[PDB]
């Protein structure tokens, strides 16, 4: 994922 | 073309709440993750929270108990609500896709939220008139004194925006009365004082007050 | 508690100088890639210069470059321009699949050095409109000068004043690198009308310039 928090 | 337009801002009583919204144009609010960030006067930037494209909101520890960040896909908006506000929460608030790792970054323009028990007060505007016995050869300075308002900010334009060259609008100073004051000045060709009208346009949105002042010689 | 520390916190350099800013994070950023460099003019939304450590977004001047790895990041300006005065921020993205943060460096203020420039000095008596409010503001304007340090003294009937004036300074001009300054002397209407000659003296290096007016003249 390009960012954190995507699960 | 793409834009993030921020709306809200102004004076809030301590213990009150703020609600700020940002409307996206050119893209869908649910395609990306969006942060809210703030900047206290004269201080650095502070992250409030991040709403992922997946719809999960991660709040800074200091903000979690009082904050919610939500989005409305129909209106294409993202919203920050904060309650139990204190004086220390006074700051300029921004919505932003920060773009630390991706091509797309975009910020709202920011809006000042002032937390204070004081009442709003609209400004008085007074002329700083160019000396009709002008004393600087071919150049003359004129301006407007915007005095005794609260809270920040006021905006100042000249001739409804047509005049920008030579304009200096100074930062506001807090007076001992607890009210703000600033000056906006501009230098113009002295020859033009008889030819050209000069009007300063002052907007104090916290008080919903607007003033237009024609600055005449003498 | 994620910390990003920039070195130095402030610096001055001349047009054409090569400038370097370092930022160190207490832990690695997301994917060892998510760091951006931002440039903020006072009051305005920060503008992103660099993303993903080293990628230059289209339209950003080529004199900006970013480098570094995971925890230590560098912004280089190969040749400083006058419009580059600003506060520069390193911004990192952090976390895991189920936790997400952003953090900001404390900021590095970049000021532009240039040759000395003498101010153009103007003095403004209070307006009759304001006098009808019971207060009198006398304004001294120093226009387009450098450096920032300038002594401004008020004289009322040749008596040097203390404690009854406030100063405000603009940010550097983005083409000229000069400053402008206002000094405002506040008196009651009654005190104002008890005296005749008002003067503001501006001292810079080896030059002192005094501008005066006699109350009631034009």
């Amino acid at each position: 994922a390009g960012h954190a928090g995507a699960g | 073309e793409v834009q993030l337009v921020e709306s809200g801002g102004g004076l809030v009583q301590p213990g009150g709440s703020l609600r700020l919204s940002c409307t996206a144009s050119g893209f869908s609010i649910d395609s990306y993750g969006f942060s809210w960030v703030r900047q206290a006067p004269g201080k650095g930037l502070e992250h409030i929270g991040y709403l992922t494209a997946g719809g999960r909101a991660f709040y800074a520890s200091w903000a979690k108990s009082r904050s919610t960040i939500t989005r409305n896909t129909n209106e294409n908006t993202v919203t920050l609500k904060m309650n139990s506000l204190r004086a220390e929460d006074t700051a300029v608030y921004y919505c932003a896709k920060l773009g630390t790792g991706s091509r797309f970054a975009i910020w709202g323009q920011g809006t000042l939220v002032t937390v204070s028990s004081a009442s709003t007060k609209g400004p008085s505007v007074f002329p700083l008139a160019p000396s009709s016995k002008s004393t600087s050869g071919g150049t003359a300075a004129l301006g407007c004194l915007v005095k005794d308002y609260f809270p920040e900010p006021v905006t100042v334009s000249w001739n409804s925006g047509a005049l920008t060259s030579g304009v200096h609008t100074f930062p506001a100073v807090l007076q001992s009365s607890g009210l703000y004051s600033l000056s906006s000045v501009v230098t113009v060709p002295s020859s033009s004082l008889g030819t050209q009208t000069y009007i300063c346009n002052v907007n104090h949105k916290p008080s919903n007050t607007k003033v237009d002042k024609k600055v005449e010689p003498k | 508690d994620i910390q990003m520390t920039q070195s130095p916190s402030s610096l001055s350099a001349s047009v054409g100088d090569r400038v370097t800013i370092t930022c160190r994070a207490s832990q690695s950023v997301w994917r060892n890639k998510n760091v951006a460099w931002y440039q903020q003019k006072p009051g305005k939304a920060p503008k992103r210069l660099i993303y993903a450590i080293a990628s230059l977004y289209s339209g950003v001047p080529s004199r900006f470059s970013g480098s570094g790895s995971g925890t230590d990041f560098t912004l280089t300006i190969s040749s400083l321009q006058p419009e580059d005065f600003a506060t520069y921020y390193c911004v990192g993205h952090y976390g895991s699949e189920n936790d997400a943060y952003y953090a900001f460096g404390q900021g590095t203020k970049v000021e532009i050095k240039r040759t000395v420039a003498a101010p153009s000095v103007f003095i403004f008596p209070p307006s009759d409109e304001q006098l009808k409010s019971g207060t009198a503001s006398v304004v001294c304007l120093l226009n387009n000068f450098y450096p920032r340090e300038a002594k401004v003294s008020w004289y009322v009937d040749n008596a040097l004043q203390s404690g009854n004036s406030q100063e405000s300074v603009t940010e550097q001009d983005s083409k000229d690198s000069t400053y402008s300054l206002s000094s405002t002397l506040t008196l009651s209407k009654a005190d104002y009308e008890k005296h005749k000659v008002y003067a503001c003296e501006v001292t810079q290096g080896t030059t002192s310039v005094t501008k005066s007016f006699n109350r009631g003249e034009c």
Side-chain angles (χ1 to χ4, degrees):
Chain A
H3 299 84
Chain B
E1 204 281 295
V2 312
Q3 210 188 356
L4 208 50
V5 175
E6 190 171 346
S7 80
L11 183 62
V12 175
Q13 300 298 304
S17 305
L18 66 72
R19 186 198 146 289
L20 308 173
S21 289
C22 285
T23 304
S25 304
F27 60 95
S28 289
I29 199 72
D30 53 58
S31 298
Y32 306 105
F34 286 89
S35 300
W36 284 88
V37 176
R38 68 179 193 191
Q39 188 168 44
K43 308 266 189 113
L45 300 163
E46 185 179 21
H47 189 247
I48 302 168
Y50 182 59
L51 178 65
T52 68
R56 230 196 317 191
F58 299 95
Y59 303 97
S61 61
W62 64 264
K64 180 158 67 65
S65 70
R66 297 183 296 152
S67 302
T68 66
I69 295 166
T70 59
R71 73 192 177 200
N72 184 324
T73 58
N74 178 238
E75 296 209 77
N76 209 34
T77 61
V78 61
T79 296
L80 170 67
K81 298 178 204 172
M82 289 181 58
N83 58 47
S84 313
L85 290 186
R86 302 170 56 178
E88 287 73 9
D89 297 307
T90 292
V92 177
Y93 290 74
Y94 302 91
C95 56
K97 179 183 188 304
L98 291 167
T100 55
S102 53
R103 285 177 303 179
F104 186 32
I106 193 174
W107 289 60
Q109 72 276 12
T111 186
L112 179 63
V113 178
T114 307
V115 187
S116 174
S117 290
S119 294
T120 66
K121 176 181 184 326
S124 306
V125 180
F126 305 115
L128 300 167
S131 183
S132 37
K133 237 195 224 35
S134 179
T135 356
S136 198
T139 311
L142 57 93
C144 283
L145 178 62
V146 188
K147 204 168 139 73
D148 291 350
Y149 65 89
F150 186 88
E152 296 208 66
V154 303
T155 59
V156 185
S157 73
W158 286 88
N159 294 345
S160 303
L163 179 54
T164 56
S165 175
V167 174
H168 295 294
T169 295
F170 293 88
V173 305
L174 182 65
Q175 302 167 106
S176 51
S177 61
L179 304 175
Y180 288 97
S181 171
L182 65 70
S183 279
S184 177
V185 304
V186 61
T187 50
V188 296
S190 53
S191 83
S192 76
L193 293 176
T195 322
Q196 176 69 53
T197 293
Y198 294 102
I199 306 178
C200 76
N201 325 106
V202 185
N203 201 2
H204 184 231
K205 303 222 192 136
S207 71
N208 290 309
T209 306
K210 199 196 300 179
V211 182
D212 301 296
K213 181 69 187 182
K214 185 167 171 289
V215 178
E216 304 188 302
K218 177 268 293 301
Chain C
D1 279 294
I2 302 159
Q3 304 281 294
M4 299 182 72
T5 310
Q6 305 180 203
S7 307
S9 285
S10 67
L11 67 96
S12 322
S14 304
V15 169
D17 283 357
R18 185 163 164 99
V19 170
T20 295
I21 301 169
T22 302
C23 180
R24 48 168 177 255
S26 52
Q27 68 190 81
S28 51
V29 297
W30 183 248
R31 296 175 99 261
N32 300 305
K33 293 192 156 27
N34 287 48
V35 48
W37 287 95
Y38 272 87
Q39 177 199 70
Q40 191 186 28
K41 308 285 193 161
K44 317 293 268 210
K47 287 169 160 300
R48 189 188 67 176
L49 309 172
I50 305 279
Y51 72 95
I53 297 170
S55 295
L56 190 77
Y57 184 60
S58 278
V60 178
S62 59
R63 58 178 180 274
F64 298 100
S65 66
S67 64
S69 185
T71 51
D72 299 275
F73 316 106
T74 305
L75 181 71
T76 301
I77 311 172
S78 62
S79 177
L80 196 63
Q81 288 294 127
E83 53 268 29
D84 293 346
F85 87 90
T87 298
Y88 291 84
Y89 289 93
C90 189
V91 184
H93 185 55
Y94 305 84
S96 64
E97 291 179 305
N98 291 288
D99 197 23
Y101 310 83
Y102 288 90
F104 294 84
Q106 83 277 11
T108 299
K109 189 184 190 298
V110 172
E111 300 175 350
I112 307 297
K113 275 151 57 210
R114 59 149 293 161
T115 65
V116 293
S120 302
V121 186
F122 305 84
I123 188 163
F124 296 98
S127 70
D128 298 333
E129 298 98 302
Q130 184 189 22
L131 291 179
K132 288 190 273 207
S133 77
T135 303
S137 300
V138 196
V139 179
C140 191
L141 168 65
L142 287 56
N143 214 25
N144 302 333
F145 69 98
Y146 188 93
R148 188 184 266 248
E149 292 68 43
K151 200 190 80 179
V152 184
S153 299
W154 283 98
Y155 292 81
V156 183
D157 281 340
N158 289 304
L160 173 59
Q161 299 294 287
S162 162
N164 48 4
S165 63
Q166 288 187 291
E167 287 178 7
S168 183
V169 69
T170 56
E171 62 211 65
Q172 289 193 277
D173 191 76
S174 41
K175 312 160 89 151
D176 256 15
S177 304
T178 58
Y179 301 94
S180 289
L181 181 147
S182 62
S183 181
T184 308
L185 179 76
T186 299
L187 297 154
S188 72
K189 179 198 141 91
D191 287 351
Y192 175 71
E193 297 176 330
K194 286 172 176 59
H195 307 280
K196 290 70 51 166
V197 182
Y198 291 82
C200 66
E201 180 196 61
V202 180
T203 302
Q204 185 195 62
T206 59
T207 297
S208 291
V209 183
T210 307
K211 294 278 178 176
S212 61
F213 70 85
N214 308 305
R215 178 182 48 84
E217 306 200 3
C218 289

Coordinates of all heavy atoms in Angstrom, one line a residue, chain C residues 189-216:
Chain C
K189 N -6.4 61.8 22.6 CA -6.7 63.1 21.9 C -6.2 64.3 22.7 O -5.6 65.2 22.1 CB -8.2 63.2 21.6 CG -8.5 64.5 20.8 CD -10.0 64.8 21.0 CE -10.3 66.3 21.2 NZ -10.5 67.0 19.9
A190 N -6.4 64.3 24.0 CA -6.0 65.5 24.8 C -4.5 65.6 24.8 O -4.0 66.7 24.6 CB -6.6 65.3 26.2
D191 N -3.8 64.5 25.2 CA -2.4 64.6 25.1 C -1.9 65.0 23.8 O -1.0 65.8 23.7 CB -1.8 63.2 25.5 CG -2.0 62.9 27.0 OD1 -2.4 63.8 27.8 OD2 -1.7 61.7 27.4
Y192 N -2.4 64.5 22.7 CA -2.0 64.8 21.4 C -2.1 66.3 21.1 O -1.2 67.0 20.6 CB -2.8 64.1 20.3 CG -2.5 64.5 18.9 CD1 -1.3 64.2 18.3 CD2 -3.4 65.2 18.1 CE1 -1.0 64.6 17.0 CE2 -3.1 65.6 16.8 CZ -1.9 65.3 16.3 OH -1.6 65.7 15.0
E193 N -3.2 66.9 21.5 CA -3.5 68.4 21.3 C -2.7 69.2 22.3 O -2.7 70.5 22.1 CB -4.9 68.7 21.4 CG -5.8 68.0 20.3 CD -7.2 68.3 20.4 OE1 -7.7 68.5 21.6 OE2 -7.9 68.3 19.4
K194 N -2.1 68.6 23.3 CA -1.2 69.4 24.2 C 0.2 69.7 23.6 O 0.9 70.5 24.2 CB -1.0 68.7 25.5 CG -2.2 68.8 26.4 CD -2.1 67.9 27.7 CE -3.3 68.0 28.6 NZ -4.6 67.7 28.0
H195 N 0.5 69.2 22.4 CA 1.8 69.3 21.8 C 1.7 69.7 20.4 O 0.7 69.5 19.7 CB 2.7 68.1 22.0 CG 2.8 67.6 23.4 ND1 3.6 68.1 24.3 CD2 2.1 66.6 24.0 CE1 3.5 67.5 25.5 NE2 2.6 66.6 25.3
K196 N 2.9 70.2 19.8 CA 2.9 70.8 18.5 C 3.7 70.0 17.5 O 3.2 69.7 16.4 CB 3.5 72.2 18.6 CG 2.7 73.3 19.3 CD 2.5 73.1 20.8 CE 3.9 72.9 21.5 NZ 3.8 73.0 22.9
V197 N 4.9 69.6 17.8 CA 5.8 69.0 16.9 C 6.0 67.5 17.2 O 6.3 67.1 18.3 CB 7.2 69.7 16.9 CG1 8.2 69.0 15.9 CG2 7.1 71.2 16.7
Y198 N 5.7 66.7 16.2 CA 5.8 65.3 16.3 C 6.9 64.8 15.2 O 6.9 65.3 14.1 CB 4.5 64.6 16.0 CG 3.5 64.8 17.1 CD1 2.8 66.0 17.2 CD2 3.4 63.9 18.2 CE1 1.9 66.2 18.2 CE2 2.5 64.1 19.2 CZ 1.8 65.3 19.2 OH 0.9 65.5 20.3
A199 N 7.8 63.9 15.7 CA 8.9 63.5 14.8 C 9.2 62.1 15.0 O 9.1 61.5 16.1 CB 10.1 64.4 14.9
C200 N 9.6 61.4 13.9 CA 10.1 60.0 14.0 C 11.5 60.0 13.4 O 11.7 60.5 12.3 CB 9.2 59.0 13.4 SG 8.9 59.0 11.6
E201 N 12.4 59.5 14.2 CA 13.8 59.5 13.8 C 14.2 58.0 13.6 O 13.9 57.1 14.4 CB 14.7 60.0 14.9 CG 16.2 60.0 14.7 CD 17.0 60.2 15.9 OE1 16.9 59.4 16.9 OE2 17.8 61.2 16.0
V202 N 14.8 57.7 12.4 CA 15.2 56.4 12.0 C 16.7 56.4 11.9 O 17.3 57.2 11.1 CB 14.5 56.0 10.6 CG1 14.9 54.6 10.2 CG2 13.0 56.2 10.7
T203 N 17.3 55.5 12.6 CA 18.8 55.3 12.6 C 19.1 54.0 12.1 O 18.6 52.9 12.5 CB 19.3 55.5 14.1 OG1 18.9 56.8 14.5 CG2 20.8 55.4 14.1
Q204 N 20.0 54.0 11.1 CA 20.6 52.8 10.4 C 22.0 53.1 10.2 O 22.4 54.0 9.4 CB 19.8 52.5 9.1 CG 20.2 51.3 8.4 CD 19.8 51.2 6.9 OE1 20.2 52.0 6.1 NE2 18.9 50.2 6.6
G205 N 22.9 52.3 10.8 CA 24.3 52.5 10.6 C 24.7 53.9 10.9 O 24.5 54.4 12.0
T206 N 25.3 54.6 10.0 CA 25.9 56.0 10.1 C 24.9 57.1 9.8 O 25.3 58.2 9.8 CB 27.2 56.1 9.3 OG1 26.9 55.9 7.9 CG2 28.2 55.2 9.8
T207 N 23.7 56.7 9.5 CA 22.7 57.7 9.0 C 21.5 57.7 10.0 O 21.0 56.7 10.5 CB 22.1 57.4 7.6 OG1 23.2 57.4 6.7 CG2 21.0 58.3 7.2
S208 N 21.1 58.9 10.4 CA 19.8 59.2 11.1 C 19.0 60.1 10.2 O 19.5 61.2 9.8 CB 20.1 59.8 12.5 OG 20.7 58.8 13.3
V209 N 17.8 59.8 10.0 CA 16.8 60.6 9.3 C 15.6 60.9 10.1 O 15.0 59.9 10.7 CB 16.4 59.9 7.9 CG1 15.5 60.9 7.1 CG2 17.6 59.6 7.1
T210 N 15.2 62.1 10.3 CA 14.1 62.5 11.1 C 13.0 63.2 10.2 O 13.4 64.1 9.5 CB 14.5 63.4 12.2 OG1 15.5 62.8 13.0 CG2 13.3 63.6 13.2
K211 N 11.8 62.7 10.3 CA 10.7 63.3 9.6 C 9.7 63.8 10.6 O 9.4 63.1 11.6 CB 9.9 62.3 8.7 CG 10.7 61.8 7.5 CD 10.7 62.7 6.3 CE 11.5 62.3 5.2 NZ 11.3 63.1 4.0
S212 N 9.2 65.1 10.5 CA 8.4 65.7 11.5 C 7.2 66.4 10.8 O 7.2 66.6 9.6 CB 9.2 66.7 12.3 OG 9.7 67.7 11.4
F213 N 6.3 66.7 11.7 CA 5.2 67.6 11.3 C 4.7 68.4 12.5 O 4.9 68.0 13.6 CB 4.0 66.8 10.7 CG 3.3 65.9 11.7 CD1 2.2 66.5 12.5 CD2 3.6 64.6 11.9 CE1 1.6 65.7 13.4 CE2 2.9 63.8 12.8 CZ 1.9 64.4 13.6
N214 N 4.1 69.6 12.2 CA 3.5 70.4 13.2 C 2.0 70.2 13.2 O 1.4 70.2 12.1 CB 3.8 71.9 12.9 CG 5.3 72.2 12.8 OD1 6.1 71.8 13.6 ND2 5.6 72.7 11.6
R215 N 1.4 69.9 14.4 CA 0.0 69.6 14.5 C -0.8 70.8 13.9 O -0.5 71.9 14.2 CB -0.4 69.3 15.9 CG -1.8 69.0 16.1 CD -2.1 68.8 17.6 NE -1.6 69.8 18.5 CZ -2.1 70.9 18.7 NH1 -3.3 71.3 18.2 NH2 -1.5 71.8 19.6
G216 N -1.8 70.4 13.2 CA -2.7 71.4 12.6 C -2.3 72.0 11.3 O -3.2 72.6 10.6

